[PDB]
Amino acid sequence: LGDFMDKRDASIKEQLSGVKDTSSEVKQLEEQANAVMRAARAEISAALNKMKKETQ
Amino acid sequence: TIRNSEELRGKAIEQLEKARARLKKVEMDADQFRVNGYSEIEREKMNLINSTYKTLEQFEN
């Protein structure tokens, strides 16, 4: 019965570390989406500015 | 406590599904926008050279 006390509790606790891990991964997805969209934006900004000045 | 734990697993897993869908769709915006802005500034390049060539022919006129 001791294992059953642990099993229900560890499983309940495990879901807790899993839902926390999933929330940390969605925060890292938001930060990578931030970096990839500003990556494309700053790519275009720098490329057009430099190529503009050079061919001017 | 069982209800809290498995509801949190389901709602966090659909939160990560919507977050990864937003990653793919904002990367779709990012590379579509990359192609668009890149070709847009090459036609604005050709606009700049057209303007200067036209004012040169105005000069010789």
Side-chain angles (χ1 to χ4, degrees):
Chain A
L1 268 172
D3 280 357
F4 296 161
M5 271 181 63
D6 289 345
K7 282 179 187 172
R8 271 187 315 272
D9 202 333
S11 295
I12 294 169
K13 183 178 179 180
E14 149 160 16
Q15 294 300 320
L16 192 144
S17 179
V19 65
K20 182 182 68 65
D21 178 76
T22 302
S23 294
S24 180
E25 286 290 321
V26 306
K27 287 183 179 178
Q28 286 189 358
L29 285 185
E30 293 180 357
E31 189 179 1
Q32 291 295 317
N34 188 3
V36 70
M37 183 176 282
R38 293 182 183 174
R41 293 182 183 174
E43 272 181 352
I44 296 170
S45 174
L48 62 80
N49 196 2
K50 176 62 183 174
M51 190 173 177
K52 186 177 80 171
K53 179 174 70 176
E54 185 176 1
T55 312
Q56 277 178 358
Chain B
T1 308
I2 286 296
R3 186 163 301 278
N4 285 319
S5 290
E6 196 166 2
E7 275 192 351
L8 284 179
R9 184 175 68 90
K11 285 190 176 181
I13 196 168
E14 87 170 4
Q15 181 178 0
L16 194 138
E17 286 178 356
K18 296 297 186 292
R20 187 66 54 84
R22 190 178 182 88
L23 179 65
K24 190 175 292 294
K25 191 172 181 180
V26 174
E27 188 177 0
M28 185 65 71
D29 195 6
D31 58 3
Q32 182 69 38
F33 175 69
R34 184 181 184 273
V35 171
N36 194 6
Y38 199 77
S39 300
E40 189 74 24
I41 65 98
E42 83 177 2
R43 70 163 289 276
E44 294 295 322
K45 180 68 68 186
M46 294 300 293
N47 196 4
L48 295 174
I49 67 98
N50 287 320
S51 68
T52 302
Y53 190 74
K54 193 73 181 296
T55 191
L56 178 62
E57 281 183 347
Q58 177 184 0
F59 182 82
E60 192 176 1
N61 194 10

Coordinates of all heavy atoms in Angstrom, one line a residue, chain B residues 19-59:
Chain B
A19 N 1.1 27.3 -29.6 CA 2.3 28.1 -29.6 C 3.2 27.6 -30.7 O 3.9 28.4 -31.4 CB 3.0 28.0 -28.3
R20 N 3.2 26.3 -31.0 CA 4.1 25.8 -32.1 C 3.4 26.1 -33.4 O 4.1 26.3 -34.4 CB 4.3 24.3 -31.9 CG 5.3 23.7 -32.9 CD 6.7 24.2 -32.7 NE 7.2 24.1 -31.3 CZ 7.7 23.0 -30.8 NH1 7.9 21.9 -31.5 NH2 8.1 23.0 -29.5
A21 N 2.1 26.1 -33.5 CA 1.4 26.6 -34.7 C 1.7 28.1 -34.9 O 1.9 28.5 -36.1 CB -0.1 26.4 -34.5
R22 N 1.8 28.9 -33.8 CA 2.1 30.3 -34.0 C 3.6 30.4 -34.4 O 3.9 31.4 -35.2 CB 1.8 31.1 -32.7 CG 1.9 32.6 -32.9 CD 1.6 33.3 -31.6 NE 1.7 34.7 -31.8 CZ 0.7 35.5 -32.1 NH1 -0.5 34.9 -32.4 NH2 0.8 36.8 -32.3
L23 N 4.5 29.6 -34.0 CA 5.8 29.6 -34.4 C 5.9 29.3 -35.9 O 6.6 30.1 -36.7 CB 6.7 28.5 -33.7 CG 8.1 28.6 -34.2 CD1 8.8 29.9 -34.0 CD2 9.0 27.4 -33.7
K24 N 5.2 28.3 -36.4 CA 5.2 28.0 -37.8 C 4.6 29.1 -38.7 O 5.0 29.4 -39.7 CB 4.6 26.6 -38.1 CG 4.8 26.2 -39.5 CD 4.3 24.8 -39.7 CE 5.1 23.8 -38.9 NZ 6.5 23.6 -39.4
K25 N 3.5 29.7 -38.2 CA 2.8 30.7 -39.0 C 3.5 32.0 -39.0 O 3.5 32.7 -40.0 CB 1.3 30.8 -38.5 CG 0.5 31.7 -39.4 CD -1.0 31.6 -39.0 CE -1.8 32.5 -40.0 NZ -3.3 32.5 -39.7
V26 N 4.2 32.4 -37.9 CA 4.9 33.6 -37.9 C 6.3 33.4 -38.6 O 6.8 34.3 -39.2 CB 5.1 34.1 -36.4 CG1 6.0 35.3 -36.3 CG2 3.7 34.6 -35.9
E27 N 6.7 32.1 -38.7 CA 7.9 31.9 -39.6 C 7.4 31.9 -41.0 O 8.2 32.3 -41.9 CB 8.5 30.6 -39.2 CG 9.8 30.3 -40.0 CD 10.4 29.0 -39.6 OE1 9.9 28.3 -38.8 OE2 11.5 28.7 -40.2
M28 N 6.1 31.6 -41.3 CA 5.6 31.7 -42.6 C 5.5 33.2 -43.0 O 5.8 33.6 -44.1 CB 4.2 31.1 -42.7 CG 3.6 31.1 -44.1 SD 4.6 30.1 -45.2 CE 4.3 28.5 -44.6
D29 N 5.0 34.0 -42.1 CA 5.0 35.5 -42.3 C 6.5 36.0 -42.5 O 6.7 36.8 -43.3 CB 4.4 36.2 -41.1 CG 4.1 37.7 -41.4 OD1 4.2 38.1 -42.5 OD2 3.7 38.4 -40.4
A30 N 7.4 35.4 -41.7 CA 8.8 35.9 -41.8 C 9.5 35.6 -43.1 O 10.1 36.5 -43.7 CB 9.6 35.3 -40.6
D31 N 9.3 34.4 -43.6 CA 10.0 34.1 -44.9 C 9.2 34.6 -46.1 O 9.8 35.0 -47.1 CB 10.4 32.6 -44.9 CG 9.2 31.7 -44.9 OD1 8.0 32.1 -44.8 OD2 9.4 30.5 -44.8
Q32 N 7.9 34.6 -46.0 CA 7.1 35.3 -47.0 C 7.4 36.8 -47.1 O 7.6 37.3 -48.2 CB 5.6 35.1 -46.7 CG 4.7 35.7 -47.7 CD 4.7 35.0 -49.0 OE1 4.8 33.8 -49.1 NE2 4.6 35.7 -50.1
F33 N 7.6 37.4 -46.0 CA 8.0 38.8 -45.9 C 9.4 39.0 -46.3 O 9.7 40.1 -46.9 CB 7.8 39.3 -44.4 CG 8.2 40.7 -44.2 CD1 7.6 41.8 -44.7 CD2 9.3 40.9 -43.3 CE1 8.0 43.1 -44.4 CE2 9.7 42.2 -43.0 CZ 9.1 43.2 -43.5
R34 N 10.3 38.0 -46.1 CA 11.6 38.1 -46.6 C 11.7 38.2 -48.1 O 12.3 39.0 -48.7 CB 12.5 36.9 -46.1 CG 13.9 37.1 -46.5 CD 14.8 35.9 -46.0 NE 16.2 36.2 -46.4 CZ 16.7 35.9 -47.5 NH1 16.0 35.3 -48.5 NH2 18.0 36.2 -47.8
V35 N 11.0 37.2 -48.8 CA 10.9 37.2 -50.2 C 10.3 38.5 -50.7 O 10.8 39.1 -51.7 CB 10.1 36.0 -50.7 CG1 9.8 36.0 -52.2 CG2 10.9 34.7 -50.3
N36 N 9.2 39.0 -50.1 CA 8.5 40.2 -50.5 C 9.4 41.4 -50.4 O 9.5 42.1 -51.4 CB 7.2 40.3 -49.7 CG 6.3 41.3 -50.4 OD1 6.5 41.8 -51.5 ND2 5.2 41.6 -49.6
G37 N 9.9 41.7 -49.3 CA 10.7 42.9 -49.1 C 12.0 42.9 -49.9 O 12.4 43.9 -50.4
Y38 N 12.6 41.7 -50.1 CA 13.8 41.6 -50.9 C 13.5 41.9 -52.4 O 14.3 42.8 -53.0 CB 14.3 40.2 -50.7 CG 15.8 39.9 -51.0 CD1 16.8 40.3 -50.1 CD2 16.2 39.2 -52.2 CE1 18.1 40.1 -50.4 CE2 17.5 39.0 -52.4 CZ 18.5 39.4 -51.6 OH 19.8 39.2 -51.8
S39 N 12.5 41.4 -52.9 CA 12.1 41.7 -54.3 C 11.7 43.1 -54.5 O 11.9 43.8 -55.5 CB 11.1 40.7 -54.8 OG 11.6 39.4 -54.8
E40 N 11.0 43.6 -53.4 CA 10.5 45.0 -53.4 C 11.7 46.0 -53.5 O 11.6 47.0 -54.2 CB 9.6 45.3 -52.2 CG 8.9 46.6 -52.2 CD 7.7 46.6 -53.1 OE1 7.2 45.5 -53.4 OE2 7.3 47.7 -53.5
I41 N 12.7 45.7 -52.7 CA 13.8 46.7 -52.8 C 14.7 46.5 -54.0 O 15.4 47.4 -54.4 CB 14.6 46.6 -51.4 CG1 15.4 45.3 -51.2 CG2 13.6 47.0 -50.3 CD1 16.9 45.3 -51.6
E42 N 14.6 45.3 -54.7 CA 15.3 45.3 -55.9 C 14.6 46.0 -57.0 O 15.2 46.7 -57.9 CB 15.6 43.8 -56.4 CG 14.5 43.1 -57.1 CD 15.0 41.7 -57.6 OE1 16.1 41.4 -57.3 OE2 14.2 41.0 -58.3
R43 N 13.2 46.1 -57.0 CA 12.6 46.9 -57.9 C 12.7 48.4 -57.6 O 12.7 49.2 -58.5 CB 11.1 46.5 -58.1 CG 10.2 46.8 -57.0 CD 8.7 46.8 -57.4 NE 8.4 48.0 -58.3 CZ 8.1 49.2 -57.8 NH1 8.0 49.4 -56.5 NH2 7.9 50.2 -58.7
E44 N 12.8 48.7 -56.3 CA 13.1 50.1 -55.9 C 14.6 50.5 -56.3 O 14.8 51.6 -56.5 CB 12.8 50.3 -54.5 CG 11.3 50.2 -54.1 CD 10.5 51.2 -54.8 OE1 11.0 52.4 -54.9 OE2 9.4 50.9 -55.3
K45 N 15.5 49.5 -56.3 CA 16.8 49.7 -56.9 C 16.7 50.1 -58.3 O 17.3 51.1 -58.8 CB 17.6 48.4 -56.8 CG 19.0 48.5 -57.3 CD 19.7 49.4 -56.4 CE 19.9 48.7 -55.1 NZ 20.5 49.6 -54.2
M46 N 15.9 49.4 -59.1 CA 15.8 49.7 -60.5 C 15.1 51.0 -60.7 O 15.3 51.7 -61.7 CB 15.1 48.5 -61.2 CG 15.9 47.2 -61.3 SD 17.4 47.3 -62.1 CE 16.9 47.6 -63.8
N47 N 14.2 51.4 -59.8 CA 13.6 52.7 -59.8 C 14.6 53.8 -59.6 O 14.5 54.8 -60.2 CB 12.5 52.8 -58.7 CG 11.5 53.9 -58.8 OD1 11.6 54.7 -59.8 ND2 10.7 54.1 -57.9
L48 N 15.6 53.6 -58.7 CA 16.6 54.6 -58.4 C 17.5 54.8 -59.7 O 17.8 55.9 -60.1 CB 17.4 54.2 -57.2 CG 16.9 54.0 -55.8 CD1 17.9 53.5 -54.8 CD2 16.3 55.4 -55.3
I49 N 17.8 53.7 -60.3 CA 18.7 53.8 -61.5 C 18.0 54.4 -62.7 O 18.5 55.2 -63.5 CB 19.4 52.5 -61.9 CG1 18.5 51.4 -62.4 CG2 20.1 51.9 -60.7 CD1 18.4 51.2 -63.9
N50 N 16.7 54.1 -62.8 CA 15.8 54.7 -63.8 C 15.7 56.3 -63.7 O 15.8 57.0 -64.6 CB 14.4 54.2 -63.8 CG 14.4 52.8 -64.4 OD1 15.1 52.5 -65.4 ND2 13.6 52.0 -63.8
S51 N 15.5 56.7 -62.4 CA 15.4 58.1 -62.1 C 16.7 58.8 -62.5 O 16.7 59.9 -63.1 CB 15.1 58.3 -60.7 OG 16.2 57.9 -59.8
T52 N 17.9 58.2 -62.1 CA 19.1 58.9 -62.4 C 19.5 58.9 -63.9 O 20.0 59.9 -64.4 CB 20.2 58.3 -61.5 OG1 19.9 58.4 -60.1 CG2 21.6 59.0 -61.7
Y53 N 19.1 57.8 -64.6 CA 19.4 57.8 -66.0 C 18.5 58.8 -66.7 O 19.0 59.4 -67.7 CB 19.2 56.4 -66.5 CG 19.7 56.2 -68.0 CD1 21.0 56.1 -68.2 CD2 18.8 56.1 -69.0 CE1 21.5 56.0 -69.5 CE2 19.2 55.9 -70.3 CZ 20.6 55.9 -70.6 OH 21.0 55.7 -71.8
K54 N 17.3 58.9 -66.3 CA 16.4 59.9 -66.9 C 16.9 61.3 -66.6 O 16.8 62.2 -67.6 CB 15.0 59.7 -66.3 CG 13.9 60.4 -67.1 CD 13.7 59.8 -68.4 CE 12.6 60.5 -69.2 NZ 11.3 60.5 -68.5
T55 N 17.4 61.6 -65.4 CA 17.9 63.0 -65.2 C 19.2 63.2 -66.0 O 19.5 64.4 -66.3 CB 18.0 63.3 -63.7 OG1 18.2 64.7 -63.6 CG2 19.2 62.6 -63.1
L56 N 19.9 62.2 -66.3 CA 21.1 62.3 -67.1 C 20.7 62.7 -68.6 O 21.3 63.6 -69.2 CB 21.9 61.1 -67.1 CG 23.2 61.2 -68.0 CD1 24.1 62.3 -67.6 CD2 23.9 59.8 -68.1
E57 N 19.6 62.1 -69.1 CA 19.2 62.4 -70.4 C 18.6 63.8 -70.4 O 18.7 64.5 -71.4 CB 18.2 61.4 -71.0 CG 18.9 60.1 -71.5 CD 17.9 59.1 -72.1 OE1 16.7 59.3 -71.9 OE2 18.4 58.2 -72.8
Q58 N 17.9 64.2 -69.3 CA 17.5 65.6 -69.2 C 18.7 66.6 -69.2 O 18.6 67.6 -69.9 CB 16.7 65.8 -67.9 CG 16.3 67.2 -67.6 CD 15.6 67.4 -66.3 OE1 15.5 66.4 -65.5 NE2 15.2 68.6 -65.9
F59 N 19.8 66.2 -68.6 CA 21.0 67.0 -68.6 C 21.5 67.2 -70.1 O 21.8 68.3 -70.5 CB 22.1 66.3 -67.8 CG 23.3 67.1 -67.7 CD1 23.5 68.2 -66.8 CD2 24.4 66.8 -68.5 CE1 24.7 68.9 -66.7 CE2 25.6 67.5 -68.4 CZ 25.7 68.5 -67.5

